[PDB]
Amino acid sequence: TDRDRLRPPLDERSLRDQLIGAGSGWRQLDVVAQTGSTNADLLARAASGADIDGVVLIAEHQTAGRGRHGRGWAATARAQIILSVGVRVVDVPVQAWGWLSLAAGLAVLDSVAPLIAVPPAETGLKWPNDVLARGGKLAGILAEVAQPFVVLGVGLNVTQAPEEVDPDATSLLDLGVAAPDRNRIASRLLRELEARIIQWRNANPQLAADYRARSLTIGSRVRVELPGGQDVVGIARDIDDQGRLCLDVGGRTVVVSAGDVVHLR
Ligand SMILES: C[C@@]1(O)[C@H](O)[C@@H](COS(=O)(=O)NC(=O)CCCC[C@@H]2SC[C@@H]3NC(=O)N[C@@H]32)O[C@H]1n1cnc2c(N)ncnc21
């Protein structure tokens, strides 16, 4: 396609020079041509005894991508920023681990928001980990546990065409960003991610405050698809200290730890 000409390879050396060294918490960065799932790969390293804290794995292409709740993640080569990072979480209370996921989505959103000329409606964060722009899914986040670590996975559509992955998908290119530089975006993303992880680790109140400011879900009428198939309709009001969605259901409070959110009119 013509989008191929808009997809130059990542510069691994440059990313390492920018993100590994004094002032940065990242300890290792690798760009692989192809893998099944970057999340699976880092989990596998951890399972074999590796210290994956601050370790970054980026894949140009991902052939067996994983979504939440056993779903899939589709990609074509060089069309996305596909990465996983390792985070040591054992030093943080387990009840707060849910916010690490929310922090990641916030980091992704902040890294790409200024690239758009004018931000269209419905641009922000859908609970739990959807980056939305113009109602389309720009990025998906997946957090998986492997003691003492959490592996955070980001799939960000840069030039990815919606017809290649999902009808509800969008990308930076489809938002009007003519020539997105994945090297620059990856660098900005990982710098934002480091900051949010540090905030999360120290229970910084600004994390929750910043999340609320970008939330498309809070204040909206929603249908929440719960694990198991049940649907609950209400109005989203807040996120609690565990990262759970608090719903107003006819005056009753329903707190959801996991589910798929659909924003209603
Ligand atoms: C087909 C779909 O409807 C999927 O069922 C669904 C998955 O949504 S989900 O359950 O909320 N899960 C997520 O969004 C988390 C995805 C995390 C992927 C990252 S990439 C590197 C890392 N390693 C790994 O295997 N997973 C993580 O989004 C759609 N989708 C499928 N690819 C899509 C696309 N590129 N754009 C938009 N929508 C898509």
Which alpha helices (H) appear in the chain, and where do they start and end?
A: 12-19, 38-47, 98-112, 162-165, 182-201, 205-214
- Interval between CA 81 and ligand 1 midpoint (Å): 12
Asked if 113 and 119 touch (Cβ cutoff 8 Å), the reply is yes
How many helices, marked H, and strands, marked E, lie in the chain? 6, 14
Contacts with 247 (C-beta within 8 Å, 6 or more apart), sequence order: 222, 224, 232, 234, 235, 236, 237, 253, 254, 255, 256
- Please provide the DSSP assignment of 63-129 as one string: SSEE-GGG-EE---TTSEEEEEEEEE-TTS-GGGTHHHHHHHHHHHHHHHGGGSSSPPSS-EEETTT
Which atom of ligand 1 is nearest to 67's Cα?
12
What CATH number should be reported for the domain whose range is 1-217?
A: 3.30.930.10
Which part of the chain is CATH 2.30.30.100?
218-265
The backbone torsions φ and ψ at residue 231, rounded to the nearest 5 degrees and listed phi first, read -110, 140
The reported resolution of this PDB entry, expressed in Å, is 1.6
Q: Which CATH number fits domain 218-265: 3.40.50.2300, 2.30.30.100, 3.30.750.24, 1.10.1660.10?
A: 2.30.30.100
157 ligand 1 Cβ < 6 A: yes
Q: Which amino acid is at 52?
A: I
Spatial separation of the C-alpha atoms in residues 228 and 12, rounded to whole Å: 42
Which of 139, 143, 142, 136 has its CA nearest to residue 157?
139
Spatial separation of the C-alpha atoms in residues 223 and 205, rounded to whole Å: 28
171 ligand 1 Cβ < 6 A: no
Which atom of ligand 1 is nearest to 260's Cα?
11
Which atom of ligand 1 is nearest to 38's Cα?
23
212 ligand 1 Cβ < 6 A: no
Asked if 104 and 141 touch (Cβ cutoff 8 Å), the reply is yes
Residue with the two structure tokens 């719903």: 247
SS3 at position 158: coil
Which part of the chain is CATH 3.30.930.10?
1-217
155 ligand 1 Cβ < 6 A: yes
* Pairing assessment for the beta strands 252-256 and 245-249 based on DSSP bridges: antiparallel
Q: How was this structure determined?
A: X-ray
141 ligand 1 Cβ < 6 A: yes
- Interval between CA 23 and ligand 1 midpoint (Å): 32
